[PDB]
Amino acid sequence: MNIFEMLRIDEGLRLKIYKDTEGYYTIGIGHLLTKSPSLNAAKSELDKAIGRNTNGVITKDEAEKLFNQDVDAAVRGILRNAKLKPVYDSLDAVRRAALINMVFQMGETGVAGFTNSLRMLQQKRWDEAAVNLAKSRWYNQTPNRAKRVITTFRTGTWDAYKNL
Ligand SMILES: [Cl-]
């Protein structure tokens, strides 16, 4: 298991524009196009991201290219952020994947807002971090995904993702 397999499980794969759990236009492996209500805006963003006239459909190769760029961007965002980088540096390789997962889903700014949870992770107070992380809109809106990420922080293993 690695970060790419992990996020492919959490996000799935869809080759036509769809709406994500918040109602926003998305494509591929959880690539957000726009928070605009306008399907035309979403198609225009898609064409710009892919570099051609897509009419809202992309190939699997194109989805995986956007996915590679998005994983790379999430990692680079962690390492440039003063609140995230020291947490990331303190963690083992499995728990690093959990942090990347959060940043992929809710952005660098959203995750840096989890001040108390980040402190607990940095101190390796895993059971306590897991409780604090669950006191969140994130957990209440996407509880099955949040539970898998939280279990990964708590245990340092991939068990939440095996048999999936
Ligand atoms: Cl969920």
- Do 29 and 8 meet the contact criterion of CB atoms below 8 Å apart? yes
Nearest to residue 156, comparing CAs of 90, 83, 68?
90
CA–CA dist 56, 16 (Å, integer): 6
Catalytic residues: 11, 20
Q: How far, in Å, is the centroid of ligand 1 from the Cα of 148?
A: 9
Phi-psi region of 92 (alpha: psi -120 to 50; beta: other; left: phi over 0): beta
66: nearest Cα among 101, 30, 98: 30
- Return the structure tokens found at 81: 């952020």
Domain extent listing, the chain: 3-161
| Dihedrals phi, psi of 48, to nearest 5 degrees | -70, -35
Residue 147 Cα, ligand 1 centroid: separation in angstroms?
8
> In this structure, what token pair is assigned to residue 2?
């690695």
Q: Tokens in use for 15? A: 């080759």
> What is the distance in A from the centroid of ligand 1 to the CA of 134?
13
Question: What CATH number was assigned to the domain covering residues 3-161?
Answer: 1.10.530.40
